Write a protein that binds this ligand. Structure first.
Ligand SMILES: *c1c(F)c(=O)[nH]c(=O)n1[C@@H]1O[C@H](COP(=O)(O)O)[C@@H](O)[C@H]1O
Ligand SMILES: *c1c(F)c(=O)[nH]c(=O)n1[C@@H]1O[C@H](COP(=O)(O)O)[C@@H](O)[C@H]1O
Lengths: 257, 257
């Protein structure tokens, strides 16, 4: 029988980052992660401030910010603390352990210094997780494994998806969940976050496919919807985020019973 | 029957970037790509200058450079032109088309403005290639698809590898070859570049596995060896690069007959 987000926050095997997230999802009645896909720092920060109360998480691609600096990230952390949301850098690491360790800690971006969560592809084998965890564990961070993708022709299916689940289970001190289209693990300690979400049917011209919050949360059993253009391209991004929040939240409640 | 690098440079369906590479491999008697895995710009540039005559290509991870600037890349391009080698940013793109397009053209790094070659994982489906090619084709760049990985537990095997080959074939205007452990395509227009190479048996503690140049070029049929730590950790990096160059080159000649 299904446990609420608040009860899942207390599970014996829950990771601290997962428990913090689950508690603030419960408190704020939001299971919406904003995919803040913009190229300007000002717009990122204005969106994070205005939409912070509506979201449990703000997902970044800092490698698209034209005017990235570490001080931008400092100001994002201030907003995350004020409004209570996690920061998730959607870096989709996909290299050998020795290299990802470096890409996560170092370079210009110093991702591990500000991102509560990152994600990784499982294609390299479990060394990708070991390398990240070398940096992530001491910094008390968490990681999601990409078990399925939303795009047309995705190869993250079948035995590949099963491999991601096994890899997560086996690295539960660091791996807190999945990027997936549906519930892929039976274990309630794991979070399921789903990109490829819009209210209307459709896709983009470069292989993105959309499903609705009711489909993803209600029928497919995922926990959190990740929404970019459905919000970002709207005129009123605050009302769009509220639309998505209410959709995902009610789907969750109706699945809970 | 096997064609020399110089004859492959002339194939009807050869991509211009591939033909430039193949010609300079022939001219310089090198099929060695240096994996310049360092965190300092000065060291990157000192290695590129000293080892430039020994290599056909210099592979970067700019997201590990602590002191990246676009002026560093300008100085790398000067060295690439002086010594005649290509620049390959080993970014291993692995997101939806709409996003990779942005990560390749934009952000701080402006990768497409200086990298002759990039590479991509095939897991997202062919939209990853379409998104990159939107930026790459107008800039006359090329891309490699990651058909196999060198690390323990790699999922890039079997039908996944076959999918990468099909995806390359179908995007031959932009895709010039593979990252792979062995020849995966029959078509001589495609380049095969192989990381995970050292003269001695071994690996690292984070899942890297090594095979020798003779094994990779001679028995497995690949074209170019990518070598990082085997060179970079040596005391004399110039003599190490020469060792690797002579190994890969003689393996190539002996396979040619
Ligand atoms: C990453 C991923 F691994 C997927 O399976 N799907 C996916 O779209 N991405 C990232 O999620 C966001 C979707 O944004 P939207 O299509 O709602 O605008 C993007 O940031 C994409 O990179
Ligand atoms: C990338 C890749 F897709 C592989 O299959 N294997 C691999 O190692 N990488 C990159 O190649 C270089 C290997 O360096 P070395 O082990 O020789 O030091 C690294 O830059 C790695 O990221």
């Amino acid at each position: 029988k299904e446990l609420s987000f608040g009860a899942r926050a207390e599970l014996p095997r829950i990771h601290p980052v997962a428990s913090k997230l689950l508690r603030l999802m419960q408190k704020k009645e939001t299971n919406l992660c904003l995919s803040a896909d913009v190229s300007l720092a000002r717009e990122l920060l204005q969106l994070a401030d205005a939409l912070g109360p509506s979201i449990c998480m703000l997902k970044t691609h800092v490698d698209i910010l034209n005017d990235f600096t570490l001080d931008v990230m400092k100001e994002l952390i201030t907003l995350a603390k004020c409004h209570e949301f996690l920061i998730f850098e959607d870096r989709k690491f996909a290299d050998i352990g020795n290299t990802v360790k470096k890409q996560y800690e170092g370079g210009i971006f110093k991702i591990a210094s500000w991102a509560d969560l990152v994600n990784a592809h499982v294609v390299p084998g479990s060394g990708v997780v070991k390398g990240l965890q070398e940096v992530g564990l001491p910094l008390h961070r968490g990681c999601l494994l990409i078990a399925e993708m939303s795009s047309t022709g995705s190869l993250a299916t079948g035995d590949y998806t099963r491999a991601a689940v096994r890899m997560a289970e086996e690295h539960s001190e660091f791996v807190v969940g999945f990027i997936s289209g549906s519930r892929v693990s039976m274990k309630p300690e794991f979070l399921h976050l789903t990109p490829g979400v819009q209210l209307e049917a459709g896709g983009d011209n470069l292989g993105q496919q959309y499903n609705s919050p009711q489909e993803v949360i209600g029928k497919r059993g995922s926990d959190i919807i990740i929404v970019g253009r459905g919000i970002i391209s709207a005129a009123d991004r605050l009302e769009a985020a509220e639309m998505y929040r209410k959709a995902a939240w009610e789907a969750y409640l109706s699945r809970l019973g």
